[PDB]
């Protein structure tokens, strides 16, 4: 009996009354439209935006911390080399804006040097993320933005084959170029190659080298695309699992262990992967919200008053929209709770408070690599956690409106069976 039931749960009485009133239903639909714009159209104030930004910053920060300590070297087929120095520019090396891969004789692979092939995948992804962070991520609903990325690397030493036409695609080591494209959007890559002799005016360094430039045009900068690069970054590090060896300054923060393999940061890498996975799921809710627009007013038909049992076929759509928005908000929250140091403990807390959520540069803009980036995050992780919380706090009214609307729709989906 329903009177018995509503005397105990008078909010349900109110809900049923709202569900039978086109004017309250339309008010709830309007709210969903305004909460959707807050989530997928805004930047500062969107918890979904702040969480996507946090997932990417954490991946990028992870490398800024440990990249300088990571061994890499060898030749082009993942094989050991005799005297190959391959240097990747705009990377957070030890007191340097390059990382130098010059470990010879050891076979690349697990608990050994990262292969140059793996460093190339990692570096390309790092360059795209840093360029994008520097320009600013767009709001989630923006899928056709692009960025231009340029990066360089050099090969020197007898027998170094990582800069060779055969590997690079190019025709001639000195002067050649190559254009190639790939994919739902076309990205065009322009590779060009140059040789600098040891005995050539302007060559500070002792030695002959080849310089490779890659210019990528039309790289997409949407959340999905960038989350895919972050995942490529973190998964290449974890799968390749190279040897690292750290330098601890006396005084500041101490890294244990001091030597080992990068996979060995199992808590850290798991967390980042989870953040990225949750942020992918979160961004996917955007197509659900887009598919089920709520801007069309609803009401009775051919003269009659609204009938909640027959006129409510829009409810399924309203329920899916509302639930997707709630899911975005919950996943955003979850992303923050994965990395927030207030709830971490031991090794992992120390890694975040001491290293990841720290910058040693002289707020320099996002995406900047200096000679002091190394052993620190420099990806705005503290600021981004704070802003995620600020935006959740500023989403109080909208969250209650999303719940009201989910409940109204759910009441109509039940009445409609």
């Amino acid at each position, epitope marked *: 009996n329903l009177s018995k039931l509503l005397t105990r749960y*008078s*909010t349900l009485n109110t809900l049923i009354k709202l569900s039978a009133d086109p004017s309250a239903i339309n008010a709830a639909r309007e709210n969903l439209g305004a909460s959707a714009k807050n989530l997928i159209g805004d930047t500062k104030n969107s918890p979904a935006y702040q969480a996507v930004l946090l997932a990417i910053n954490a991946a990028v920060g992870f490398w800024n911390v440990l990249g300088y300590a990571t061994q890499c070297g060898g030749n082009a087929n993942g094989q050991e080399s005799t005297s190959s120095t391959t240097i990747f520019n705009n990377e957070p090396g030890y007191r340097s804006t390059s990382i130098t891969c010059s470990l010879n004789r050891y076979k690349p692979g697990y608990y050994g040097p990262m292969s140059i092939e793996n460093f190339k995948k990692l570096n390309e992804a790092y360059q795209i993320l840093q360029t994008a962070l520097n320009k600013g991520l767009p709001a989630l609903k923006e899928n056709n933005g692009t960025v231009s990325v340029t990066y360089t690397y050099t090969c020197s030493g007898e027998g170094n084959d990582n800069c060779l036409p055969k590997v690079t695609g190019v025709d001639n080591q000195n002067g050649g170029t190559k254009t190639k494209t790939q994919t739902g959007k076309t990205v065009t890559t322009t590779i060009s190659s140059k040789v600098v002799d040891s005995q050539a005016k302007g060559n500070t360094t002792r030695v002959s080298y080849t310089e490779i430039t890659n210019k990528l045009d039309g790289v997409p900068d949407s959340a999905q695309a960038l989350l895919a690069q972050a995942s490529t970054l973190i998964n290449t590090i974890n799968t390749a699992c190279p040897y690292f060896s750290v330098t601890n300054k006396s005084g500041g923060p101490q890294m244990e262990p001091t030597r080992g393999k990068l996979c060995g940061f199992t808590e850290e890498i798991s967390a980042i992967q989870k953040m990225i996975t949750d942020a992918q799921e979160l961004v996917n809710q955007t197509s659900v919200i887009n598919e089920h627009e709520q801007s069309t007013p609803v009401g009775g038909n051919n003269g009659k008053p609204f009938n909640p049992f027959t006129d409510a076929s829009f409810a399924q759509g309203m329920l899916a929209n509302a639930s997707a928005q709630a899911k975005m908000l919950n996943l955003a929250h979850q992303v923050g*709770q994965t990395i927030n140091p207030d*709830n971490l403990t031991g090794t992992f807390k120390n890694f975040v408070t001491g290293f990841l959520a720290t910058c040693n540069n002289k707020g320099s803009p996002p995406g900047t690599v200096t000679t002091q980036t190394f052993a620190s995050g420099c990806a705005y992780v503290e600021q981004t956690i704070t802003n995620l919380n600020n935006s959740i*706090a500023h989403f109080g*009214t909208q*969250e*209650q409106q999303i719940q009201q609307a989910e409940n109204i729709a759910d009441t109509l989906v039940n009445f409609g069976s």
Partner: nanobody, 113 residues
């Protein structure tokens, strides 16, 4: 995973009340927390919120008159209500934002001459 409000009662208009919430650590720690209320014939309404670092924000209906605060050492959340009007009459509830799906029992506030 638990929430427990207290401090409500019947007061006169112009009056003042301090509400408390005892939350569990898993709810409270590192989370934005806030207060809500549910007035007669209406659905639950968001009232105030506060970040882990202590920055508060308020709904227009209470801004200037209520103050939200948190004690991070005891997982307590507080709401100081001043200049009460009959329209502040409601069951008040606390939660984290976004909300844990099981609410506490609430505390009744009635303002009336």
């Amino acid at each position: 995973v638990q929430l427990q409000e207290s401090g409500g009662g019947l007061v006169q208009p112009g009056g003042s009340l301090r509400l408390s919430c005892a939350a569990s650590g898993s709810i409270f720690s590192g989370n934005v927390m806030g207060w809500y209320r549910q007035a007669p014939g209406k659905l639950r309404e968001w009232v105030a919120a506060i970040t882990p670092q202590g920055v508060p924000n308020y709904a227009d209906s209470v801004k200037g008159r209520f103050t939200i605060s948190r004690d991070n050492a005891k997982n307590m959340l507080y709401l100081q209500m001043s200049s009460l009007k009959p329209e502040d009459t409601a069951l008040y509830y606390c939660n984290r934002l976004p909300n844990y799906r099981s609410w506490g029992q609430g505390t009744q506030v009635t303002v009336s001459s």
